[PDB]
């Protein structure tokens, strides 16, 4: 009678640890949400047939709102497994559910997952040198979100990354491009003018990290803008001061411009 | 003709993906390196007896001045794969040889696992809040560094959280602890005088990431600082801010004295 939150990985079903594979393969009841990313390598039946198990799977309203009446219920009886995509509690809310859990006399033990947090490495910038993150969100009706750009002008004036994770709204199966956001970014900098995001700033897209292939592609903004990345999900890195070595991985990995090997130290 | 750069994982064993796990066993040549960590909760040949692939260590040196001449001449006629505890690319310097592999005419792909940069926000600390990492070193002869308590101040000025790799000596097996790392935090404090750690500093404490049983402390550094957290490697955390949220969770997880509910938010 125990609740696991085990997270499924980057890409596809077998980036899920052994670890969450074994525990995952063990429990009475699974439940699972696809809302917070997309793993664009597997389907519901791929990871259904490699636990062996039936998957509930559930909608942000039931996770948000009804998470302890179908979830926690279960945990007190049998061993239920909630599963996520990446690892289950990054860039997410779901660390409060285990809150959840735990008024409800429930115990929870979290399976981490490989994270696109740290799969930014395979970008070749340091990633200690990323600073505070943000996630570029779709306009909405005459709202239009713009705080992304002030962390993206904080970290740079401190000479670091900045990660930007792309809006997804699974129920229209909208996927946001690495192309949109940076349309988003080039009105917000009309409106803000802040010099800081504009067609000369050199960027990072990282397309289906956790795939054996994924894309990886470094340049100036007015070249890559209008660039196909291939399906999502995609992300989008802001870098910020170079050392010599990024540069070099971003033009030999990333096909970035042999320029930007010129660092203005 | 294939190079796999392979992550094991956070603690033991099982912390390798299903991915990585089926692709290393298939690899006619298996590496690996404990310099940049040490997977505290197993052994080399439990690793190698998952795996099924006898593995062959290499030390800095043989990576970092050698790996062009004992990896790569055989992935170029065999699938090699080169296994590093967390996240590959995490570790500063391995991105770098990918650029060596190309420039052997050798494929190299990239299999992610848990990274503690993503696996920390089991601390229920807001992953986007992170801000530049540091590590910390123990001062040594006439040297006494200090920039990754500028790093914490920088950071926490902003209203970011810090993490904190302790110094790790991987040939000796000797790691720093997370009471020793407080403790030079302190002595830096005396010098530089910037109210950045003192006794009455919020820090969280991470041990065991990956276990099904980690320790996850949090509290004032007087209180802590001689707390018992376990058997390394420890994770050393200086949080900004905190949203309510987060203080829950330190609260309700952590046991965090309910004192933070309204000091350190
Ligand atoms: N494989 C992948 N490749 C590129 N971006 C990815 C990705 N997986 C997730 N993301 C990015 O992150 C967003 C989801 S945020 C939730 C992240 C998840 N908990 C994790 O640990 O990865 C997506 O909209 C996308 O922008
Ligand atoms: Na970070």
Known sequence: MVLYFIGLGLYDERDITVKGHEIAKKCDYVFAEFYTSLMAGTTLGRIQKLIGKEIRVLSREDVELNFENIVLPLA???DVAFLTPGDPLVATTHAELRIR???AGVESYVIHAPSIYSAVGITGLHIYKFGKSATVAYPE???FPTSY???????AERGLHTLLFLDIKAEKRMYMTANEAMELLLKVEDMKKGGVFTDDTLV???ARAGSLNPTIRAGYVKDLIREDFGDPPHILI???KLHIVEA?????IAGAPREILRVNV
Chains 1, 2 share one sequence.
């Open 141 to 143: 009706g005459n709202w």
């Open 238 to 240: 802001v870098p910020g």
């Open 248 to 252: 070099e991985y971003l033009v030999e």
């Open 101 to 103: 859990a735990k008024r």
């Open 149 to 155: 750009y002030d962390v993206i002008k904080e970290n």
């Open 76 to 78: 007190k009886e049998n």
């Open 204 to 206: 990072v897209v990282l």
